[PDB]
Amino acid sequence: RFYFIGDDDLLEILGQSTNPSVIQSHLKKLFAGINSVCFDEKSKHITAMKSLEGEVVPFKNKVPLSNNVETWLNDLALEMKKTLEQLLKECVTTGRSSQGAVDPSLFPSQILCLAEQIKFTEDVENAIKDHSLHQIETQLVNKLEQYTNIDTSSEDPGNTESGILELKLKALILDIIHNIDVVKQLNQIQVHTTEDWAWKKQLRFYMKSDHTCCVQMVDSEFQYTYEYQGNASKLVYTPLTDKCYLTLTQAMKMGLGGNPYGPAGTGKTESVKALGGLLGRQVLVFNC
């Protein structure tokens, strides 16, 4: 990752291999997700990470600091990926039970949105196999009504102390509206089975038996690479993004790049970062 750090900070991180002020001042520019970290009671381990607004996720194990800098940066990378992986499994494991696992303090929004989309996918692919099931559309309408009603419980207090993450709700409403429109169009065309291409046109988030995600469009598939994004502004799913997503995923299936274009001021630049957000990669926007 060091090709984007200047020399001026890189020799600091090589030299100051124990200084906490250096780590909190320059670990932000290395991993874009983590804004700051904590320290344990002797400054010998790192136990948590933060966000811009203060979204805090603990790590599943302490991280031993040392002098050789790669020999704990590698530990950060592995332990972040393992922490998000086990946290996703725990969330989906409680969520596929009958009762709701609604506890939005306990998980970051990155796992809430993903768990809701995976469970949505498996339920709808049970549905179209079994029955047209307007019950599921009515269930989504009532669930969305519930979230919009609970949204008025945090809006009136607003600025409190040690209470944020009304944003985890607002980053969930949009995916629910997406699912509303998908089920409504499946109702309008009356699709018979799963192999009908009006379902496989739509973006699918399956689960693999190794418990890791596998984002799969029409036939091309990828893997979720567990980059911790934190809170960020997502996009409204206009039907132009259908065009964009399908072209880029088929181009990646053929092993090529992708060149969106058009006049000035549309959304092509942020669409790529949005795809990288929905996929689990990290995006390094440049200028040429």
Partner: protein
């Protein structure tokens, strides 16, 4: 080696089927499968060969590759050697949404691609004698296709070939004419420009020597439009007169040169128009025809003022040739109707008609003089063109007004087709899109590429 497209239909099919290898086509499952491969081959060949007529079959020259064709072959491989009963829908769905529509920006070319994709999943039937999975019969039907090509295979009318061969013949004759073979400013390579100007403006000294007052918004929003129109017109006319007086004095008089004089002289010697003139108003690339159109609108807008001072602009038959910016005029009508009715401006619609006066509209104005191509217009019915069909067809007049939403339109929704209304034959910018009564079988009227031009000259 020049590395390009084949110059004909069956040439393109021969190149295609030479590029295939026969073990690809010869699979066990045979009969319903290679005919789809021939459909892909004909579709690729057709979409490439539409490009010879511009802007008719496509609005620009879109780049279609052989990599696109091989990607499509990959698609049809994964379909037919995929399990059962390939939906013809999603072949053209994925095909438009990824491969061939990924070149397209205008909407009407997307419509044309939609029509070919819907059509080719049946042929000109007499020329099409398909066969079984025998590969050399697929080779031999190509020789059964004739040498010369016909736009009836494609959908264009027959006057297309007349205009095309006139222009291409003049091109090749001038090109073989090439193989046989500051003083010019002091000479007369540019004198007929000034000569046409002196014929346009010798008895209109008021029309290039009057000053309108700089005005703000009056009562009704149709007065302000025409006053700004008058002001912009007189401003552009006097700017042109200055830009020609300078280049007149450097030739037929006693003065010296600047750089902008050289810019005007260079552009007019190459007989293009300078960028300063196109900064104000887009005109024809002929500077002569540009001066023609300009002086015509200069007479016109004074007549528009004379008949619109008395609010008699509702009764008289008028023509949209004479508006520099006609959609702003139509949106001024939108404001006057939305103010006269007593309803918000967002809740109106724009529908014109031919079978009588508008009932539910607020105002009715007679607009005629439109020109049409790609078809032959009649009241209540569009008729196909013929061999001896003339190119430019005039039209029945129309009644235009603004209608409130969720009201009964004069035409039923599933009997009409939207047609763009361009500005001239170059097909550059879109004014509106009026509906015209089709009466079923709309796909022919798609693949004709029907248009409608506001005027000419």
């Amino acid at each position: 080696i020049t590395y390009e497209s084949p110059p004909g239909l069956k040439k393109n099919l021969m190149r295609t089927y030479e590029s295939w290898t026969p073990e690809q086509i010869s699979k066990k499952d045979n009969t319903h499968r290679a005919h789809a491969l021939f459909s892909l081959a004909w579709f690729h060949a057709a979409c490439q060969e539409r490009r010879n007529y511009i802007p008719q079959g496509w609005t620009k020259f879109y780049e279609f590759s052989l990599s696109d064709l091989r990607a499509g072959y990959n698609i049809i491989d994964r379909l037919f050697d995929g399990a059962k009963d390939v939906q013809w829908e999603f072949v053209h769905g994925l095909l438009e949404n990824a491969i061939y529509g990924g070149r397209i920006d205008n909407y009407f070319d997307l419509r044309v691609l939609q029509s070919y994709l819907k059509q080719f999943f049946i042929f000109p039937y007499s020329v099409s004698l398909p066969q079984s999975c025998s590969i050399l019969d697929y080779r031999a039907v190509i020789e059964k296709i004739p040498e010369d090509d016909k736009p009836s295979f494609f959908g264009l009318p027959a006057n297309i070939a007349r205009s095309s061969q006139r222009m291409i013949s003049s091109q090749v004759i001038s090109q073989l004419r090439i193989l046989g073979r500051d003083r010019e400013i002091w000479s007369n390579e540019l004198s007929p420009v000034l000569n046409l100007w002196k014929k346009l403006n010798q008895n209109s000294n008021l029309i290039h020597q009057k000053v309108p007052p700089p005005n703000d918004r009056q009562g009704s929003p149709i007065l302000s439009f025409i006053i700004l129109e008058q002001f912009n017109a007189i401003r552009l006319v006097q700017s042109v007169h200055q830009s020609l007086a300078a280049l007149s004095k450097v030739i037929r008089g006693t003065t010296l040169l600047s750089s902008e004089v050289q810019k005007l002289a260079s552009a007019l010697l190459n007989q293009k128009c300078p960028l300063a003139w196109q900064s104000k108003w887009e005109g024809p690339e002929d500077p002569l025809q540009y001066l023609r159109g300009l002086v015509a609108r200069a007479l016109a807008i004074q007549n528009w003022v004379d008949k619109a001072e008395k609010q008699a602009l509702l009764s008289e038959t008028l023509d949209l040739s004479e508006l520099f910016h006609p959609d702003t005029f139509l949106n001024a009508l939108r404001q006057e109707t939305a103010r006269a009715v007593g309803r918000s401006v967002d809740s109106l619609k724009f529908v014109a008609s031919w079978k009588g006066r508008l009932q539910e509209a607020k105002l009715q104005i007679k607009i005629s003089g439109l020109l049409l191509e790609g078809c032959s217009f009649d009241g209540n019915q569009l008729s196909e063109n013929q061999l001896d069909s003339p190119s430019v067809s005039s039209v029945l007049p129309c009644f235009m007004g603004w209608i409130p939403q969720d009201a009964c339109g004069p035409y039923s929704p599933d009997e009409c087709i939207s047609l763009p209304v361009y500005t001239s034959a170059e097909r550059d910018r879109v004014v509106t899109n009026i509906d015209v009564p089709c009466g079923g079988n709309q796909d022919q009227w798609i693949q004709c590429g029907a248009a409608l031009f506001l005027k000419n000259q």
